[PDB]
């Protein structure tokens, strides 16, 4: 039994995955996903180990650096989540792994905003967010999803989804 998914790994939808920061012990597992893209939500430069894996495997890196603040000093930039959603909604980029450091907060917000576009009720979105964030669930992350304006996205169709 040799495959090690990255921290807090899960399948979000057809072609869409979420996790925390992969390390070299996770690379054999990530190869099984046939990734085209990574959406990386931290500002820090990608380590050389991770860069060599991306290059070797023909994976494109999309970096939308969101500062990692703890409650009650969380202030998620709307523009970075919007730019990341535009990448996520283009099926040419699939399969895509979304990751941050822990796969709980920045990752959880992007996934929750996707669920809002998929017409999930807020309590269902928050329950999924909480399943990953567990004892580190942030009310501010859920408030961000509560007020995120989906108006600019209404036209973008999601025929990729398992949910039509």
Numbering used by the authors: 51 to 214
Publication excerpt:
Here, we provide the ligand/enzyme crystal complexes for one such PTP outlier: Arabidopsis thaliana Plant and Fungi Atypical Dual Specificity Phosphatase 1 (AtPFA-DSP1), herein unveiled as a regioselective and efficient phosphatase towards inositol pyrophosphate (PP-InsP) signaling molecules. Subsequently, an intramolecular proton donation by PP-InsP substrate is posited to substitute functionally for the absent aspartate/glutamate general-acid. Additionally, we conclude that the hydrolyzed phosphate remains trapped as an enzyme-product complex, until it can be released in a prisoner exchange with another PP-InsP molecule; the latter process is assisted by the WPD loop.
This oxygen makes a hydrogen bond with the unprotonated Nδ1 of His155 (we will return to this point below). We denote this orientation of Pi as pose A, i.e., Pi(A). The three other oxygen atoms of this Pi are intensively coordinated by amide groups of P-loop residues Lys151, Arg152 Lys154, His155, and Arg156. The side chains of Arg156 and Cys150/Ser150 also make polar contacts with Pi(A).
